[PDB]
RNA sequence: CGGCUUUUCCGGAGUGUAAAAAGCUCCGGGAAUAAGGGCUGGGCAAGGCCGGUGGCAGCCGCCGCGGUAAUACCGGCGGCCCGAGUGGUGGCCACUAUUAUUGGGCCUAAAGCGGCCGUAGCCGGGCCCGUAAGUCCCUGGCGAAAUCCCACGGCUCAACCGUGGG
């Protein structure tokens, strides 16, 4: 029928039912609840410290084959530990056991799997307060 | 040269207060002694009577704006103006 | 409260028709930013706007803002001094950009290219009604539009200097 | 201008008349193109239309909007096929929009235009806006609605030099019949671009649709095709 | 510019002026034989009966 | 059931000239009904127009000259003062003056462009272009 | 090639200081003396040659590139956008009529209760009489300032400030 109701003396129901049927969309849910915060490693934090812990490669999804590098790195906040992708040609020379890092969100899809790399999440920006991306391109020195 | 506005006269306080402007195309700006030994001639002031409040040279122009104020009396710079301005145009050490 | 940006960014950056356009205009012209055209650009829209808003208002409010409207655009010499509200929709940027200090001083040929005259202009080697100033963005009005001259303490001032008699043979050639 | 006054005399020797609309043109006793639509015949040789439109001739006033790669599956190999939509027009209010069909580009390219020139509608343009209201076919005169497909889309007069808001495919086509400010709104799915065009088409057909009232022409200037 | 404004034909079985490219008909009168009565393809297609302005004759 | 005889006459009214048909009728006759109808008429879109008793409420008939796009009801009684009348228009007019709107203030029911003249605002009723 | 002013830089003169400082403003010597970031297969369109790696290394928002010639990785060239800013990340509005009163749908894509009954609620036939609570117009008080729109004036112009009007 006529989405109702539309009388005059009647915004109470209106109200209620966009308020009710709000509640089937997940972004606002998401927002008002705060459940990205109270599942957040970093609490919501644009960088977050940490150590490095090993270095493992993955495997790339079908149809991609690669040995991607990553590393495993716990965080000095809460100390929750983690995996972060290490992007640079031959970055993961760089990078060795037990070295203070920075480390940010991918940019995938809602911050996501970033395409053709499940289940990582974050790559890294500084090692011992310094860029990689430099050092990538050598212009830098690590200490 | 140098050109008037503006005189007028405070008698609660016996000050001639004066708004002129400093036209000076092409050198530098002029220093206190020299404008104060120039505006007391056509006017007729005492110069230890006489104080200058300021000069200002807009951007970029000729002609600079420029207040000054004469009293009646040595005392009354004494008990109403503030020592400093006395000291910049030299009547106190 | 904040100050905002007087400017508005395009909304794609690498749309070639709006890109070309602007090149186009930017080697009629010689402005150093984008920026700029994107300013002088708001200025229109702003006018536009205050011009479509009294189109839709009734009120004597309305009219005396819509008074205060002509007049100012007037004044710019922008419009011709019979103009009506309905005109100015019509304006373009290159009206605008016809009003600005370094066109109307290369227009007056004292300058053999429009960059000679922004030159000149930061330099300030140029003057108006008797005062310097340094913007070749500036939109002039009309009624100092007589009043651009070479200034007075900048040796151009001279017409000896040896600039001179080359801007005054391009100017006849 | 006189270019194209040789042109149609030129095609006027070639071409030979076919149909019972093809005498009255080659003889003259047809020359204002309008004569075809208001009495409402059928348009079935191009050399027609471009007798009285040779502007249709101009490269600017034929667009190929839309070039597509159609395939056919066979047990013995995909067969392709190109699908081109093109639109053409003169700058004062008739456009034609046209599909082929092709095994070449060229080919395709051709009779999509042929059948664009095919398909001459008259449209009315004028000033409907809520503030420009300078009584000039700067715009459609009055908000106008067309459907087609899943595609709905409603365009809206809008003021003097605003340019032309309307997706590219609709910027295209409003461009080539002379209107240069409206805004536009859009349902559906707009990346099917040959629905697109066709329901901006529609709705420009449309804009003939609508009874006026005899002052709303000079409210307007309500113009019917040439200015 | 000369305002060259044109008689847009109209249906006198529904008033409705003719769109472009409608396969409406127009023919003088059956009856009286000088109206030149229009008919419009909505007019068409349902065949409402059709009024000739002067002698009054009416025909599917 | 019946609840607002103004908008299923209006909404007969549209779809008989969808159709092109000559002669309504509208079987709820009111005043208020007969009231509006006057008020489009002064402005040319009806023709002639009567009442006619049939000893339960009267009927009312028109003959139709093809000249309307789109007559609907504003159900929903919107009151508006006397400045806001474009805000609304924009709402259901194709375009600027496109037709009209109907208003009921406190000295009855008439067009909106005569109701802007007198400078009195009231309630939408329905709209007709 | 020949020439032209000297952005900044050195000296001096004023505002300046209640104390300088503030390098602000005027004059003089006076250099051609400061420029990057990102992208370069397509959504974006915005732009092609070569050396190398050969699905190893890597790139990549998304679509996707290299498993032996990669226009898509790396290096060089050349190019495209902006410009003293450009790039990455994270949060918010638009995009999205993917929250829908204007304005979303529910046969087949997720979406009608298995059916009927009915309370509160929501929405209700026509006409006459009276009220005027809602409804509309006029009018008093009141909704501070700061912020916002417009004209003019002061600061070279602007930003900023003032006067006036909203």
Redesign the pocket.
């Known amino acids: 029928?006529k989405?109702?109701?539309?009388?005059?003396?009647?915004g109470?129901?209106?109200k209620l039912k966009?308020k009710k049927?709000?509640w089937?969309?997940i972004?606002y849910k998401r927002?008002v609840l705060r459940l990205?915060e109270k599942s957040d490693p970093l609490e919501?934090a644009?960088?977050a410290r940490g150590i490095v812990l090993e270095k493992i490669?993955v495997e790339?999804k079908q149809?991609?084959?690669?040995?991607?590098?990553a590393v495993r790195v716990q965080l000095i906040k809460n100390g929750k530990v983690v995996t972060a992708f290490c992007?640079?040609?031959?970055?993961?020379?760089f990078i060795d056991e037990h070295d203070e890092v920075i480390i940010?969100?991918?940019?995938?899809?809602k911050?996501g799997?970033?395409?053709?790399?499940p289940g990582i999440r974050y790559?890294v920006?500084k090692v011992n307060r310094v860029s990689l991306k430099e050092l990538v391109?050598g212009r830098k020195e690590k200490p | 040269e140098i050109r008037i506005k503006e005189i007028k006269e405070n008698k609660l306080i016996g000050r001639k207060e004066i708004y002129f402007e400093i036209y000076?195309p092409?050198?530098?700006?002029?220093?206190?002694?020299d404008v104060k030994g120039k505006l007391v001639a056509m006017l007729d002031l005492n110069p230890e009577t006489t104080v200058?409040?300021?000069?200002?040279?807009?951007?970029?122009?000729?002609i600079?704006k420029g207040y000054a104020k004469a009293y009646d009396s040595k005392e009354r710079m004494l008990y109403i103006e503030?020592?400093?301005i006395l000291?910049?145009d030299g009547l106190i050490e | 409260?904040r100050?905002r940006k007087?400017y508005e960014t395009p909304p794609?950056?690498?749309?070639?028709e709006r890109?070309?356009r602007?090149?186009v205009l930017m080697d009629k012209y010689e402005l150093?930013?984008?920026?700029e055209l994107?300013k002088h650009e708001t200025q229109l829209k702003?006018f536009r706007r205050?011009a479509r808003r009294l189109l839709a208002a009734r009120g004597k409010?309305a009219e005396?803002?819509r008074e205060?409207?002509l007049?100012?655009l007037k004044?710019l010499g922008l419009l011709p001094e019979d103009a009506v509200l309905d005109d100015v929709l019509s304006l373009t940027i290159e009206d605008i950009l016809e009003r600005r200090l370094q066109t109307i001083v290369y227009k007056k040929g004292l300058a053999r290219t429009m960059r000679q005259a922004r030159?000149l202009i930061?330099?300030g080697?140029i003057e108006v009604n008797g005062?310097?100033?340094?913007?070749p963005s500036?939109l002039v009005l009309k009624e100092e539009e007589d009043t651009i001259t070479y200034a007075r303490?900048?040796?151009?001032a001279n017409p000896q200097?040896?600039?001179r008699m080359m801007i005054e043979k391009a100017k006849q050639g | 201008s006189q270019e194209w006054k040789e042109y149609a005399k030129r095609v006027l020797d070639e071409w030979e008349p076919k149909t019972k609309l093809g005498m009255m043109v080659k003889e003259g006793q047809i020359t204002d193109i309008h004569e075809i639509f208001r009495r409402g015949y059928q348009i079935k040789e191009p050399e027609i239309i471009d007798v009285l439109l040779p502007e249709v001739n101009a490269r600017e006033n034929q667009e190929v909007l839309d070039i597509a790669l159609t395939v056919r599956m066979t047990d013995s190999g995909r067969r392709v096929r190109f699908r081109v939509l093109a639109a053409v027009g003169n700058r004062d209010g008739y456009v034609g929009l046209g599909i082929g069909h092709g095994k070449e580009v060229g080919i395709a390219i051709r009779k999509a235009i042929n059948y664009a020139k095919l398909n001459i509608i008259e449209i009315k343009r004028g000033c409907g806006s809520w503030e420009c209201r300078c009584r000039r076919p700067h715009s459609v005169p009055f908000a106008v609605e067309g459907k087609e497909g899943s595609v709905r889309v409603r365009l809206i007069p809008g003021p003097r030099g605003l340019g032309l808001v309307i997706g590219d495919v609709g910027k295209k086509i409003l461009r080539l019949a002379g209107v240069q400010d409206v805004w536009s709104?859009?349902?559906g799915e707009t990346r099917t671009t040959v629905n697109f065009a066709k329901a901006v088409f529609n709705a420009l057909y449309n804009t003939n649709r609508v009874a006026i009232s005899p002052e709303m022409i000079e409210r307007y200037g309500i113009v019917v095709g040439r200015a | 510019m000369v305002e060259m404004k044109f008689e847009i034909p109209v249906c006198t079985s529904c008033g409705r002026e003719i769109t472009p490219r409608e396969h409406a008909t127009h023919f003088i009168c059956p009856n009286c034989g000088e109206a030149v009565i229009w008919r419009c393809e909505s007019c068409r297609v349902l065949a409402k009966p059709y009024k000739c302005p002067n002698c009054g004759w009416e025909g599917p | 059931?019946?609840?607002?005889?103004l908008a299923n006459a209006l909404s007969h009214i549209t779809n008989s000239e969808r159709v092109g048909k000559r002669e309504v009728y509208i079987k709820?006759?009111?005043?208020?009904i007969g009231e509006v109808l006057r008020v489009m008429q002064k402005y040319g879109y009806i023709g002639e127009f009567e009442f006619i008793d049939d000893g339960?409420?009267?009927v009312y008939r028109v003959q139709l000259l093809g000249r309307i796009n789109k007559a609907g009801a504003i159900?929903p009684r919107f009151?508006?003062?006397?400045?806001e009348f474009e805000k609304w228009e924009k709402?259901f007019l194709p375009a600027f003056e496109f037709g009209i709107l109907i208003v009921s203030?406190?000295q009855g029911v008439m067009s909106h462009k005569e109701a802007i003249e007198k400078?009195?605002?009231?309630?939408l009723i329905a709209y007709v272009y």
Request: glycine share 12%; hydrophobic share 25%; no cysteine.
């Open positions: 029928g989405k109702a109701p539309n009388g005059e003396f009647a109470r129901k209106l966009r049927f709000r089937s969309d972004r927002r990205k919501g644009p960088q490669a790339a149809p991609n084959s690669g040995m991607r590098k992007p640079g040609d031959g970055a993961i020379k940010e969100g991918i940019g995938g899809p911050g799997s970033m395409g053709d790399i790559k920006v391109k | 000076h092409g050198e530098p700006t002029p220093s206190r002694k200058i409040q300021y000069i200002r040279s807009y951007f970029g122009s000729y600079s503030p020592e400093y000291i910049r | 409260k100050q007087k794609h950056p690498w749309i070639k890109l070309d602007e090149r150093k930013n984008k920026k994107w702003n205050r409010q005396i803002e205060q409207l007049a100012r004044r030159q930061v330099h080697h005062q310097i100033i340094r913007s500036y303490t900048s040796p151009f200097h040896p600039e | 709104q859009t349902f | 059931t019946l609840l607002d005889p709820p006759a009111s005043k208020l339960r409420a009267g159900k009151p508006v003062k006397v400045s709402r203030t406190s400078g009195i605002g009231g309630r």
